[PDB]
């Protein structure tokens, strides 16, 4: 995981198709 550890998951254009939090 990477961007699914804080409270949205939408850090970037990459938490998008490998973080499940978007």
């Known amino acids: 995981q990477r961007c699914c550890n804080g409270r949205r998951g939408c850090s970037s ?4 198709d490998h973080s499940r939090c978007c």
């Not at 254009?13 to 998008?16: A, G, K, M, Q, V």
């Open 13 to 16: 254009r990459w938490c998008r």
